[model samples]
Target chain A: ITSLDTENIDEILNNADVALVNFYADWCRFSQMLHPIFEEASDVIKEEFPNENQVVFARVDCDQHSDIAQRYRISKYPTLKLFRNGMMMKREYRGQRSVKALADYIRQQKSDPIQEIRDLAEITTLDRSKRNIIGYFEQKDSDNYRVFERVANILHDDCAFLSAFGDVDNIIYKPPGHSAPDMVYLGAMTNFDVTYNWIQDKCV
Target chain B: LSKAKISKPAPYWEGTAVIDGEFKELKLTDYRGKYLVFFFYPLDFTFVSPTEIIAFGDRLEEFRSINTEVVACSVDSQFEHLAWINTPRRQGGLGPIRIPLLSDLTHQISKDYGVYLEDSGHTLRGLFIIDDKGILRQITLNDLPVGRSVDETLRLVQAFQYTDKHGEVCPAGWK
Candidate 1:
């Protein structure tokens, strides 16, 4: 089943024991290609598990329901997330291409039960002092210095700011076992290069 | 007078060529009273580029329905384009297409369109929308990693046509 609106999201989540939700944008080519795969997977699952009334498959068009997409923190199309007993169990980004590959992956997840899902809490904090400026330096070269100086000048010109130092500087930052950067930011916005490159190399 | 930044118009191209085996001269000026969507990919026998080219092929009728014509361009020769078209989709070549694909062997058109990556000797993913009056309206540039959006392009053309006919500005997310 696909939701045209987010009005019944809570009720659907609350009632369903196992929910496979896919978030997609219609314009994305990858999303378009995966739509058939998703539909076929749902059909196969329904036929195979006709006796199991717990599993529910649904899709959300992210283009229309942007708020729900944002809440799920979806950055890319064709993102698959699994929910069990009204809680998000596991999330996967850009699943494999073939219908068999995706269905098999989903089947594996269902068979191997995970631990209790953690409830995410929303925490808001106030920054009373100066604006925070966090920078990432890749190499100690002239070009790097030039780029850093230009960026620093822009930040200073924009506001009265506070400087915080955390250098990746030849050492890659990881998470859990190895801690990533405290704050990935040039000023207030997230630093993608430091976060993404590090995550790709280490986490994935 | 509004002085729009106009680069030297690309060299006028007019040539008799075979589109799906039928002969016709593919000229830039032939698209006068219609919205023309001209795009350039790097090469024919490469990944990612073929996906975009084939996507344009798939959505050709939708564009035509809105009075918009799409043309694909590459630095490869016309022979290469023909060979690629004849080759099957399973073999990574775009099968038969409704729109004509132009060859820019001299790289003059790519240079004129400001898409020539001099070092790479390949044009960036460039999509240009030329209006009915011959004024270039929209230009969407993307890196090789990213692919173009057909629906967005269609929506934009629709918005442009609607605004032109109704004499009203289209708001953001108008579609």
Candidate 2:
């Protein structure tokens, strides 16, 4: 993992379309154990997407980069934070801490083309790269809903598609064995180009 | 099927379309100078739609050579379209395709074209041919379960081009 200090984390986050940062302290047991798994995850992601791979993997030492830690408020050791276009996310990365799990998470972050989540339970079961490109739809599937998904699918190479079934608030964004994700929501639309553009304008 | 009036202007359609994995905003007027062969399917995640989509992708060069363009639409959302395209044929997906698939999710576009089914709320096998001048030259619809032929679509394009160029009608089963 690329060591990111306060001076360079901005460069790392700003330059890439997406980035996953693991904030840790060298003395923490959990952080030390996660080191190899994170490194291996980086290798898999880089090799699979040699050219299209826009996601960046980096590490930040809470002790070494305390300024960054305080700014991001890193109270816990071995915390994983996902970033897209330099902005951080509030979703939790509470999944299995294995190479496959981490790699799957990263690949999904970068390569997921199209997806629809019917419920919150499915949220935890599916490994997501970053956060849900949220959509709240109706039960009967309106034209607006279908059109929304159509736009989402078209942008799969560069974006992750996420939707909640029916008209509801507080969609799930959790991983298996993890607690409920913090409340996150993005508004909705129907036009294809408009939807995709809005996703980048606001969601990203 | 409404049998959308022959020789009339094709119904107004303007919406988002997915083209070669990218999303686009479009209108019927955008393709005014070229012929438009607008086709429709029953739904996504079915047996026949994938075959038609793949076939369309496989033979797009033929359609393109004749100065004709084909676009497919369905009641399924764009998300479903993307999932189906990204999915493998072995798993019943259409994979990447050259043409954009429009979403008739509201079913209004299908109805305007007279392809929407009242009973099932899904579109039948519908095809509309609009000549370069924007006249609705042909309309064809089929039962929901039956699949369509890409070769036949190409033939129809050829037929349309022949008629447009020579002002002579095609005889029965003209190839």
Candidate 3:
């Protein structure tokens, strides 16, 4: 992983589609333990994602540059924070800290979150062991579709997200190993906090 | 699944500790006859942690005078402990530590003490007071951001000793 500081954080964050910044300190043993793991994960991602600027992994030494740490309000060492198009996400990564887990997390973050499906028959070929969320919206840029995309980004690890732009305007979740899709949330899509939880409760 | 409990035997731990810049095998039984103030910090060479470590180091004599011994530990190795100790306090180092810096690289000690954070791969700031008879007396655990108090720890040690000797309950805010 590349070392980041105030001098290059903006450039790296602005240019990359996804930036995973590991805030760490050299003296902290936990950070030291994660050093090799992070490096290996970065290597794994680099080979799988050959295109440049799609995703980047870097670490910030909070001890050397307290300014960056202060800006992020990092209370603990070895924090993994994600950024999208130079904007920091509200959620920080608190998931498993292994090479496979880290790599999978980054890959999911970088992937095109919502799959565009033309017909409902495509859902039949999807994985039966996992849940799939399907959003039928009249337009792609509507508030409902935007909320669906936002929720898709947050719950990518839990389920597969699909979007079908049409005259219909509703979100439904297909339970695992089921032919019929269940749990159609008819709540206000503009309320992201409530909608996210509604999807997470059903999907997770 | 025996854990460190008040009035129960303290959890056993043995590891290579950096004492006076030398790697030495330190164990719980080493302080069998003296009160032990066993504590664990998150890591070394970070801000706020060194202040608490050096605070305990600077007050080593006070604990020693009361027939007690203070020991610090972290998941860091003995080599990391020594490097931090060799660096000066002015440069964000532990400087010259008076107590042994125990290394729990295996994390068994922290697990036994109930301070091992699996997600973080480090221990919270946990302090345990084991009396002369090896009975755990008091335990204080802090979040990663805050530091423990040397003066308050000293008072707790003294209070536990007094209560053990007199067979009386320590009132709240007992000095």
Candidate 4:
């Protein structure tokens, strides 16, 4: 529930893996009415992914920030724009002011930058998924790991950037399918720059 | 994130471009007298591609205010680009972008840039920077799967503009 304007949005979204925004005016009673619902939806959405800053929720006040409203071409009272990165599909929020619907809609976002492999207890128990670029690492506080974070922010839209820490064979690739999926061994994570180059080379 | 051809005369290119749900023929020269960030993507409606496009689209005014024009090109047709805009973005579907996406139906622009993948009928991730005079000042290219950063790109644009206006090179991490 952020009423974004040109002055303050210095900024989130756009660079985001996924961002949702609401374009509404202050004059419209309907906009005033739905403000709290938007905040409620933002709260629920953020609560679910508190650790990850992937799917973000925001709003734009047309009256206060007329320039922003015009740029988005918002003629309607309240328009809901579900955005991926900065690409958005704006639609009228025709449903009633229901927080449940808004929260559900926000949860439907796509593209997680990196998938976390929770149970390192068994390697064979890894989940099968499409287009994976998994990292098998020993530590996350290394310089290379910082570079890993940088690249993940940049390339989240590309493929599944997953990580399985503690101890493993290092970089692995699992193409999407059914059978015992072959995990292609990439190489050792030597340095951050080196790891970045490897992911850039293999992510395609 | 391509910065290969620095100071060479930028290639002259033109084609049908879709902007704001409509089609218009555009060219490299049309953006003369202003900075241009002409970039290439793998294809239309891809994962990494939209993220880059929309981030730039979201900051269109900020770029324009600084006297820069951002344009994206690919082998995808204008209709295919438009079709992408009609669908929701979260579901791995398509969506429209505010930035003018040039339809290089012939693929010559990307071919000239050396990023065109002939066998694949697509282009790699390539970004070029041209000054107000249309001379290619900077370029950087990425492999097919890697995604480039708009945050860094905008920083570079600011760095270049700073050097141009202030006559001094920007230091490390200028922005």
Candidate 5:
């Protein structure tokens, strides 16, 4: 029931051993829809885990405390996170669109350990440790397509090379929701000298 | 949505105001055939808010040269906006901006634009671009603490203008 104000957040979170918090914004339609379902789940958890005083449940309005929301990296609405001993144990971005589905997912998480880890890996994108070179450009045109092919060939010669051409309208990767020239290198940070040199050579 | 579908049509605004001592009843429709750079802030005289307001003022000519009109809005009243504008920048006020600051006191404008936080009674850092036709071409929302980049806004406006005129979309990292 924490309102996501600056004060009383650390104290409430610190007092709990196992906490389930929902980061939400009031203006977000999805968050508004998920509120009642999350409240019901909290009630159920309170009754079920009564003996487990370490377990706590709360929700924070991301709109008011945007600082906290950004710190938690809540890009989307209705983000759910699980914490143990004040450390993030699991997180999920935009789960199922229904209340029962979310409750069932939380219930499954409480019983299953492996599934929880897998879910955590999916949400955090940290399951695999391989390097990923995501090329976030507009379209597969002559220049960009050729540059992508050359880089893929060079990078594949050494390690795994994963490339993707983002839609001009999609803003999940690129900001401002407009097409631009940008690439994101994800999964275990690494250098891009070989890729850069390839592009430079092609320019000449 | 693509720029063609998203660009707001002319006569987009519902009303007007006397911002910066100008008796301008501003409407998105009035700026047809021109690029409109519209943004929203939480309130006037607040920390980190004036920084962005003044930054827009400083970059007014830059936007105008590119055929872009800069307009700022907030849920605060017109009196507060005028007071802040009259106050100097040294005292943390934004002073007078070349651009118009619309007062959405009733918050209908904020709600229509999807930047209003009804519970908090404040507006989010929402920005939008309206093309000559009054279509909402671009929208970006940031948290209160993180101010937006005026240069990036200019770049996007330029990119949109370029794409509209040339029919060629700007690629990522578009200058």
Candidate 6:
């Protein structure tokens, strides 16, 4: 648990595997209330995890560090943003603000964002009402898997991600309902933006 | 049931909104002198919905030239709206948008507009066209997955305005 400023925020985010930064304004009542809650959650996480650098929690005072706030587009007070590998995640934390919820969210962030399916038969057994993005790769360590992993990280909330490694190497989007046709990713596998956007276009 | 109906007064909505990076209280009557393109998206932080929201945001001047304003609503809170606005476009965010991001956290506004989906606890992609004097002119609702088109919305707004101004009915192929 640390307070980050413009000088060290970038380095902290870049070095940490998963960083949760809370952007707050001193004048905001909600920010004032969340200050202690954030610190307690950080303390719980610090003791729960063995490595300090693996998961980091930091706060930014938007009034004092307007530059960082402006760059991150901090329009409101007490915005909890997650950073992975130094890139700010598209979605900020919008869930209930409690120590248990915050700590659980951070724990989830530290784990693998994607679910692995060892058996292909498990796909058809999933709930039909929810959308899913399943990737089948030849091997787990390939570049294609890496690209899919990145896409899964960004879209883990929108749909369920299932990865199967064996022979076929492509991604498929299963729309909600039994009648909807499963759309496959026909774009180039090397381009992260295209693959991510394609899945986004179909899944949402 | 929702009070929203075509040719009737648009259902009243008053709530805190994120406008120009600040929180402001706004209501339906506030736009009594101009037309409004009031729309609802499912939530923020998604990949596709922002495209539709930003498409309207990008064409703010066009809507304003015709005496209309665009406002987007969702089940998210004002904090979520502000955070979404602060997010970058390439990162599946609205970025620095000008239009008001109305927060319908209570889901009352969405229900009043007849767009609330109980099973999902969010609104459908419901869009409404309200004219001057707060008369509801048109309504369109799409499921969660579909994104609405901006050009078509603009055309419809122009068509409705033409019908109101000139008393001439707009045909299907009307530009």
- Across all models, the iRMS values in order are 11.3, 35.8, 16.3, 20.1, 12.4, 21.8
Error of 4 at B56 (Å): 1.3
**Per-prediction TM-score:** 0.41, 0.42, 0.43, 0.42, 0.41, 0.48
Candidate 4 residue lDDT tens string, A30-103: 66777787878778778888747677777876665768867767656667776645654434345555778877
lDDT of 2 by residue, B6-80 (tens): 878877798778887877877888878888888886553334646676677678888888788888888877878
What is the Å distance of residue B161 in model 5 from its true position? Answer: 1.6
Best prediction by DockQ:
1
TM-score of 4: 0.42
TM-score (C-alpha) between model 2 and the true structure: 0.42
Looking at candidate 2 chain B, the ten consecutive residues that score lowest on lDDT are B166-175
Which ranges in model 4 have alpha carbons more than 4 Å from their true place?
A: A1-204, B1-4, B44-49, B144-146, B168-175
Q: Model 3, stretches more than 4 Å misplaced?
A: A1-204, B44-49, B144-146, B168-175
For model 6, the superposed segments whose C-alpha errors exceed 4 Å read: A186-191, B1-175
**Whole-model lDDT for model 2 versus the true structure?**
0.69
lDDT of 6: 0.80
Interface RMSD for candidate 5 relative to the native interface: 12.4
How is the predicted docking of candidate 4 categorized under the CAPRI scheme?
A: incorrect
Predicted structure with the largest TM-score when compared to the true one: 6
TM-score, cand. 5 vs. native = 0.41
Q: Summarize candidate 6's per-residue lDDT along A124-199 as a digit string, tens digits.
A: 7776667788888777887888888877776677788888777558887777867778777787986777887798
Per-residue lDDT for B50-137 in model 1, tens only?
5776778788899999999988777887777788778787887767776777878887777777777777786777888877766777
lDDT of 2 at B66: 78
Model 3 agreement with the true structure over B1-175: per-residue lDDT tens digits: 3388889999889999999889999999999999999988656333464677777888899889989899988898999889888888788677888889999999889999998878768677888989999999998887754577878888898878766653322221221
- What is model 2's interface RMSD? 35.8
